[PDB]
Structures are given as C-alpha cells and as structure tokens.
Amino acid sequence: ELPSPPSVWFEAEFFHHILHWTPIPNQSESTCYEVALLRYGIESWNSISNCSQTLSYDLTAVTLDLYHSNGYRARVRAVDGSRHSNWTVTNTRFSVDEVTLTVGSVNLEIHNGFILGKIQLPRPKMAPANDTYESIFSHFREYEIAIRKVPTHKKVKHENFSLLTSGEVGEFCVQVKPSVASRSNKGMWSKEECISLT
Amino acid sequence: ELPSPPSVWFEAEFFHHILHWTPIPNQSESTCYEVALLRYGIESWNSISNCSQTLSYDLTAVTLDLYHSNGYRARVRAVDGSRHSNWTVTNTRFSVDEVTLTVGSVNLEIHNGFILGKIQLPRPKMAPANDTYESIFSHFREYEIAIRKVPTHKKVKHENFSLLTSGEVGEFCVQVKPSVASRSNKGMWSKEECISLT
Amino acid sequence: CTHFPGYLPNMLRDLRDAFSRVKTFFQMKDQLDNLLLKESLLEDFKGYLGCQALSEMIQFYLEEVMPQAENQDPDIKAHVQSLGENLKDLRLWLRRCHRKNAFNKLQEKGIYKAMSEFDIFINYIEAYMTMKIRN
Amino acid sequence: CTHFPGYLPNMLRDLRDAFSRVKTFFQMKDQLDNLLLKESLLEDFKGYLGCQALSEMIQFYLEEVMPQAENQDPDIKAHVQSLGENLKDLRLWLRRLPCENKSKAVEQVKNAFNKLQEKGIYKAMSEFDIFINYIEAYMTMKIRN
Amino acid sequence: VPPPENVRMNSVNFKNILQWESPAFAKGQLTFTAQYLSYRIFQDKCMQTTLTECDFSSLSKYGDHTLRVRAEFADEHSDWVQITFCPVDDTIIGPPGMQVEVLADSLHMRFLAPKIENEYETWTMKNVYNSWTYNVQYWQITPQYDFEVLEPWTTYCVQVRGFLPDRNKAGEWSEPVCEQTTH
Amino acid sequence: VPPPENVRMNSVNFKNILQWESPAFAKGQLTFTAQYLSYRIFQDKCMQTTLTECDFSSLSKYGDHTLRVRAEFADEHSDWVQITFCPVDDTIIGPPGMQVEVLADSLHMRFLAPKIENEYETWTMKNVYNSWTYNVQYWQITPQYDFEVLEPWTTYCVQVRGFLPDRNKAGEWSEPVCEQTTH
C-alpha cells in the first residue's frame, strides 16, 4: 500500500484560500497530489483536480464563498498513477476564524497640525468584488499598530491613526495585524509602512 | 358592654350605594349607630357621622369612584351615648361585582312595517356625568327582552331590536333585564313598558 | 388564534363565577386589610418580555397557592381545585394562541457537535444582537 | 443597559477565544460534518414568545452543554468550564433591550404574599377578582390591537 | 382480571358520562379509580361504583381533561381506556327546540336551543358558542337571521338543527315537529 | 475547630490570587476545599492545600463568581468565608505603566494599560474596560485620550494611576514615575 498524506492543513488567507499539505512519504516520480475543497452546508467534498503534482492547488475559486458560508471542509490526496493512497482531510471546518485575516494597505502622512495614516482593508480581486473584508466586519474590527523607529504599540478599531510624531520628526516604521473584536482570528502581519517626518 | 352590630351588607343598585345594616335589638331612644367607610389603598377608615340613628345611610357621594376604584369596605359600631360597642364590618369587600345592574328606560312603538324598541342608558346626576351605563361597560352589554301579552324571551347584544310582532296585532308589555356577558353581576328587570298593536 | 375571542367572554365569566364559590370564605378570613392590589399587571409587564410575568402568575396560582390553600381548610376543597383547573384551561388556551429534538436524535455525536459549533453560535449571537440593538 | 453595550466586544471575544482552546478537540471529534449550526438564532425568534427562545438557547449553551462537555473529556476541562462561565457572564449582563429587558415587580407580586405566610395564603385568594379584572384589562388591549 | 371495555361517552350538551359495562366476573368487580389531570396534583375524581359509568359533568367545558383511569383487584391492577376530552370540540350538539305558532293562515317558529344541565347556574348552548346560527333544512332552506315566519297540503315538514359558521357542525335534527298545511 | 480568617486578596487589574491564612494548629491542618460557582456543577477549584493561598484568577472577567468554601476533619467541618467576586466592578485597578521621555526641552508620558494574566494570549485590560482613560495626578494634571503631551526645577513630579472615565477609579499611583525638570 502507499502512505497516507503526512499532514493536510488549511492556509486560508483573506480570500486567498491557498491549501498547503505535507507529501506522502517516499513519493514516486509518478506521485501526484489531489487538492480539494468542501463547504459546510454541503454534504460531500468538492474536487479540484485529478492530478496536482504540486503539494497544493488553490480552491479559492470554488471557496470564494468561504467567508460568509457556514464553514468548509478541505483535503489533499496524494496519488501515484493507478495505485492511490488515502486522503488526509481537515477534521475542523475551515472558516475565517481559522483563516488568517489581513488588511489591504497602510500609509503614513504628515499634516500641518498633526500626522495621519489611513489604512486599506483587504478586497481581493478574485473574490466577488461587491463584497470586501471591510464590508463583512462592519461594526467590530480591531487591529494592533506597532510603531518603532528604524533601528510604541496600541490596539485600534479604526483604519486611520495619528501618533506622537504628529508635530515631530524622525524615522518610524509601522506594522498592522488585523483581528475581529467578535473573533480572536489569528491575523497575519499586513504590508509594512514607514515615513520620514524630518 | 353593649352588643356589637349584627350584620352590615350592601344594597347597591346602579349608582345607588345605600349602605344598609341591621340595627341592634331593643335599641333605646338614646341608641345611635356610627358609620364608617374604607377604600382599598388606605390603611384606616374614614368617618361619616358620630351618630346615624337610621337603619341605613347613603354613601354615594364618596363612593362615586366605585367603578374605577378597586372597591370599598365599610363597617358600623353601635353606640348608646358615651358607651360604645365594637365594630361590625362588611365581610365581603364591596367592589363593582356587587352592583346590581339596570337600564335607563325602554319604549314600545309601531311602524308601518315593524315593531321596534330603543333603550336609554342610565346616568344619574350625582354620578360624574361623563360616565354612564354605556361608558364603563365599553365592549360588552347583553340584555334579555321579555315581551308578554297583557294577560317570549330572547338574548340579544344590541340596544335595538325588532320581533315577530313586526307584522302582528295585540296588547304587549315589555321588560328588559340587562347583564354583562363577561361578568356575573346580578342584573335587575328594568323599567316596564307596554303598548297595544291591536 | 383559532377564532379564540369568541370564547374569551365566557371563559372570564367562568373564572369570576367559579371564584365566587370560595370568595365568601377567604375574603371573610382575610381580615388584616393589606392593600396589595396587584397594580403592576397592566401598568407593568406590558410591551413584550414583561407579559411572561403573567404566565408566571398563572403558574404561581396553579401550583404555589392552589394545593397549599386547598389543605388550608380541608373539608371543602373541590371549590378551590375546580378553580385551579379553570385557570389551567386558560393557560392551555394560551399555549396554542398568541401567548432540539433532531439534536436529541443523535445523543452520542451531538455531545461533540454542540461543543464544536460554539464559535458559529457566537457569530450568530453577534449577528442577531446587531439586529436587536438598532431596533 | 448597565453599560452592557460598552462590554459587548469583550464578552464575545472571550467566548470565542475560550472556545478556541477546546475547538481543536471538539471540531476534531465531530468528524461527520453534520450541518446543524443552530442557524435559527438570527433568522427566527421574533415576537414576545419567540424572542425568549433564542435565550433558552443561550441557557442551553451556558447550562445544557458546557458542564457536560467539561467532563466528557477531563484533561481539557477548564476549556468547557470557561464555556459555562462565558455564557453566564453574558446572560447576566443581559436582561439587565426588549430581547431580554426584565421586570422586577413580579417579585413584589409573590413575596408580599409570603410576608404573612399563614395569612397571605388567604389574601392571595381574596384578591382574585382584581386579578380577573387585570387579566381582562390587558385582554381588551390585546384584542383592540 | 377481565376489565370493562367498549367505552361510549355521551357529551351531548356537556353531560360527560362514560359507559364501560363493568364486568360481573370474579376478578372484574373490585375497586377502580378515575384519576384526572388536575391543574397540577393529578388527583382522583371518583371512587368505586359498581356501574363503571361515574358521572364527570363537573369537568370544565373549554379546556381538556385527561381521563387517566385504572381498575384493580386488591392485589392486581386491571386495564383502562384513557379517552382524552375537550368537551367544546369533542362533543355532540343537542337537538334544538322551538317556540311554535298555531295560526293556520301563517305559521311561525321562534327557534330555541338546548340547555346545559349546570347545577349552579342556568345556561343555553347558544351562550357557549358565540357564532351559533340555526339551520332549518327540509323539502335548501336556511333560517332567517333569527326566527322563521310563514302552501299546498304537503306533509314534508320542518326539521331544525344547530349550525356553526367555521366549525361546520350539526346537532341532531329537530325532525319530529311536522307542520300543518292548509287550504 | 478554629477556622482560618483575615483573608486579603488583591485583584488589582484582575490578578485574582487569594489567601485565607490557613491555620497551622493541630485541628486546623486537615482537608479544606475552595469550591466555585461552576456553570452547573458548583465544583471545587482545588483540593486541600496546607497553604490557604489558592489562586483564583481563573474566574471570568465580566461576570461574578461565589467562593463558597469549607475545611474539615474526618467527622467535622470547619468554617469558611465565601466572598463572591465580580472582577470587572469588584476589583482594584492596577497601576498602569507608561513610556516616559528623557528630553529636557519636552517631557512626555505614553500611558499603557494593566494586563490580565492570560496564559494563552496577550491581552490589555482595555478589552475588558470600555471607558479607560489614564489619569496622571501628582503635585491637577490629567492625561489626554491615550497619552499625555506637554518647567522650572521642581521635585514635585508625575504620578499616574489607572482610571476609568465613568467609574472614575484609581490604580496604584505611579508616584515613582518622577519627571525631569530643567533650566
């Protein structure tokens, strides 16, 4: 017989449901891997390919409805030609709270009486563009801003912030990691920002 | 000591709250009776007279609020000058459910094609004239009609009725007894009327 | 409801006139003239949630007071039991009128599922609280 | 409420994050992907009789399932105890909002009776007629509208 | 312990009397109870009557009543037949009466209802059912709003019944009351 | 059965560690319990520990918990002191921290909140408290929304405490956090 997949896990970023999996031990040159998706509310999985040679295959295109839907079930299944191993699947429904969330962009600006920054909320193109992350988490959202000099932290529920550098000078860099006040979802460190006040 | 009053009970027709009590047996020419009243919500009685010598006394003027008010409770104590007996009280609190109902007037008339009857609804002058038999019993009123020849009954919801005598001849007298279908107050046969269709 | 207001007046008539049978006894012995007049029924408990205090009132009478006061004087007890029944008939006329099993189908696995769908329960307490708050 | 709307974010964050500790085990053991998600919560329970049910569901969470799931596997039991705790902490800040706004008079209704136990037995059954007149009082409101 | 059976309960105008034909066999006579769904207590409401048909007219007329019953020997319990009632719906309607005219040249019938056998007060079935409306149907006719007033010598003649608008139901007909036709 | 007494529990910023001063006498050593108001069970937090100082930080933030307890011999129970906690409002406010400036020409203090001892994640008290607002009160000054912005050589200098805007309350003061005056 052939070994089952070593590890099969869900990497669901904001509307980037990129599945990742561990290969079968001692995979052949004839070895291939399946990629699958399933959404909760559906009684059985959905398929992505007869062969993925890659360890992974994005199911986002079918999983575009991941964020709103009741949940998801996904899998990967290595195969070696005629003889096939069994699948390894995610026991736990794939939701946004499993999905490491992220924002769209951040910025830093200096004004006459204060500094300002106005961040962007992830809205992936592949996602159906009428609905964006900014739109689903309407009332509760909360994200930490870290500001450090090039060579300090606060928790915020707003895309925009100002800081002590408002009337100041110096080199300071920022990161934002999102969350939802309702949900403890494990955000992902979003795109960096840094600005000179000098 | 002197005997307390034997029994204190109410004969209250529509808007005639005449308190009644039996007098002490073998009352002296010096005999007198106190009269008292109480309304629920008050912790202690109110007085009406140091002496009432008569067997009975109208409290209507203070009891005008009987219908909206939860009720009333009254009592008597006998007195013979300085020396006074203990009180006798109304065992059953006097509420709206005690008031014997009746109507204001009835009539008999003959038309070209039918008989009719058209009642009037009592409102006494002493009553606060905004309220009348029509006003408290807002939704329900129901009264039996008796029609008899000089030497026959049905239950109706409405102040006006016509009857088999619509095309008939004869001498007929009418009584009306009101009630409230939602209530058990003991109506009384209201004022008589009589007309000959012969 | 099931054309229920055609019955209401007669039911109230049955409650008043049934109560009248024991009134002469309890009203005659309740001599301490306490003035609790149950003011709150219409002036309170209105809107929506307060109402259920009256359903609790019904159950209060039927269980709390009926079988204790029934033995409070034992010789004449049908007069109070028939009154409790005559209000229970109205409670039953509330259940039908204006005022889980599929889980219990699988006991052995619902124990897991009920404690794995708790995050979605949170998401929904959030969802319908966000309705219950605006309006 | 008692600044309940000031706390609304923290209570749900803590319930979801408290749930997260046992989620791996519970979602791992409920592998048959059954689609019972207690959906009716948002889609239903409107009206006085219906609205309280969602709360009954709350009581199911705090009481029915939490303290059984705590011992169903004992090694991780703080994680389910935290589920009972995190639903009592929300219910208690609820009712204190027509979905749960309560009324305290209904206890003046009963205790003032129990004040004189031997005699309140009588008075509660001497004030019955006024009880009739108030049940009728809101009957003629609930009928007109 | 041969139990009584073949229950027939006749609720015409709320006289809720049952009949089971209590058996006179050796094990079929000894004590039995008719417990009810009291508001809460669930008490007993008749002792042993050689006739199984204890009256239960006391039961209320608008709710529902469980008829939990048992039968037993001193050392053995017999079978029972729990018919749940809801006398308002689960009942028969009596045959109407009438107030009747004697005039040949024009007949009339004032209609009259069955009366409940209430020991304490007096009631008429019309009182209980709020939308009551008689139906007279004979050689179809339907009564006027309340009463009937006013051919060849035909012996096909009146019968009258109760009727209900939405719970279309019929009491036994008042068929015996034939009418006198005339020249 | 001389019971333990003089409990003093400092829950400043929700660090709920208790101490009941368990008695070391001959009849004061034997088993004791620290029951809590569990969701349903109403279970014991922990088994008899000769040292009374059992932690109770485990209690949730926003609700309340009774601390019903006992101590006992094989045949007798020693008395106990059931203090119910409601840590959000039944607590002390820890002393906030701060990041402080050294520049002579302008002082600064950025306020930082106290932290709950959450083993699993990293938290700030502001999640629990909604109206948080630092107060610096020393020889009065008062902080801006999060941090304070904007002297002769005076040794009277900053002190800071936790504060809540509407339940105005004070943490331990940061009297230690002195400020640098300058020419």
From Swiss-Prot, chains A, B:
It comes from the Eukaryota. GO terms for cellular component: apical plasma membrane; cilium; cytosol; nucleoplasm; plasma membrane. Glycans are attached at residues 26, 50, 86, 130, 160. Disulfide bonds join 32-51, 173-194. Its main location: membrane. The keyword Metal-binding does not apply. Phosphorylated. Phosphorylation of the cytoplasmic tail induced STAT3 activation. Cell surface receptor for the cytokine IL10 that participates in IL10-mediated anti-inflammatory functions, limiting excessive tissue disruption caused by inflammation. Upon binding to IL10, induces a conformational change in IL10RB, allowing IL10RB to bind IL10 as well. In turn, the heterotetrameric assembly complex, composed of two subunits of IL10RA and IL10RB, activates the kinases JAK1 and TYK2 that are constitutively associated with IL10RA and IL10RB respectively. This is Interleukin-10 receptor subunit alpha. The lineage of its organism: Eukaryota, Metazoa, Chordata, Craniata, Vertebrata. The gene is IL10RA. The chain holds residues 25 to 227 of 578 of the full protein.
Swiss-Prot record, chain C:
It is found in: Secreted. Its main location: secreted. GO terms for biological process: B cell differentiation; B cell proliferation; branching involved in labyrinthine layer morphogenesis; cellular response to estradiol stimulus; cellular response to hepatocyte growth factor stimulus; cellular response to lipopolysaccharide; chronic inflammatory response to antigenic stimulus; defense response to bacterium. The keyword Signal applies. GO terms for cellular component: extracellular region; extracellular space. Keywords: Cytokine, Disulfide bond, Glycoprotein, Secreted, Signal. It comes from the Eukaryota. Disulfide bonds join 1-97. One of its GO terms (molecular function) is interleukin-10 receptor binding. Produced by a variety of cell lines, including T-cells, macrophages, mast cells and other cell types. Major immune regulatory cytokine that acts on many cells of the immune system where it has profound anti-inflammatory functions, limiting excessive tissue disruption caused by inflammation. Mechanistically, IL10 binds to its heterotetrameric receptor comprising IL10RA and IL10RB leading to JAK1 and STAT2-mediated phosphorylation of STAT3. In turn, STAT3 translocates to the nucleus where it drives expression of anti-inflammatory mediators. Belongs to the IL-10 family. Homodimer. Interacts with IL10RA and IL10RB. This is Interleukin-10. It comes from Homo sapiens. The chain holds residues 30 to 178 of 178 of the full protein.
UniProtKB/Swiss-Prot annotation, chain D:
GO terms for molecular function: cytokine activity; growth factor activity; interleukin-10 receptor binding; protein dimerization activity. One of its GO terms (cellular component) is extracellular space. It is found in: Secreted. Keywords: Cytokine, Disulfide bond, Glycoprotein, Secreted, Signal. Its main location: secreted. Produced by a variety of cell lines, including T-cells, macrophages, mast cells and other cell types. One of its GO terms (biological process) is negative regulation of cytokine production. It comes from the Eukaryota. Disulfide bonds join 51-99. Glycans are attached at residue 101. Major immune regulatory cytokine that acts on many cells of the immune system where it has profound anti-inflammatory functions, limiting excessive tissue disruption caused by inflammation. Mechanistically, IL10 binds to its heterotetrameric receptor comprising IL10RA and IL10RB leading to JAK1 and STAT2-mediated phosphorylation of STAT3. In turn, STAT3 translocates to the nucleus where it drives expression of anti-inflammatory mediators. Belongs to the IL-10 family. Homodimer. Interacts with IL10RA and IL10RB. This is Interleukin-10. It comes from Homo sapiens. The gene is IL10. The chain holds residues 30 to 178 of 178 of the full protein.
UniProtKB/Swiss-Prot annotation, chains E, F:
One of its GO terms (molecular function) is coreceptor activity. Residues 1-183 are extracellular. It comes from Homo sapiens (Human). Keywords: Antiviral defense, Disulfide bond, Glycoprotein, Membrane, Receptor, Repeat, Signal, Transmembrane, Transmembrane helix. This is Interleukin-10 receptor subunit beta. The keyword Glycoprotein applies. Disulfide bonds join 46-54, 157-178. Its main location: membrane. The keyword Transferase does not apply. GO terms for biological process: cellular response to virus; cytokine-mediated signaling pathway; defense response to virus; immune response; inflammatory response; interleukin-10-mediated signaling pathway; positive regulation of cellular respiration; positive regulation of receptor signaling pathway via JAK-STAT. The chain holds residues 21 to 214 of 325 of the full protein. Changing residue 27 to E: Risk factor for HBV infection; higher cell surface levels. It is a single-pass type I membrane protein. One of its GO terms (cellular component) is plasma membrane. It comes from the Eukaryota. It is found in: Membrane. Belongs to the type II cytokine receptor family. Shared cell surface receptor required for the activation of five class 2 cytokines: IL10, IL22, IL26, IL28, and IFNL1. The IFNLR1/IL10RB dimer is a receptor for the cytokine ligands IFNL2 and IFNL3 and mediates their antiviral activity. The ligand/receptor complex stimulate the activation of the JAK/STAT signaling pathway leading to the expression of IFN-stimulated genes (ISG), which contribute to the antiviral state.
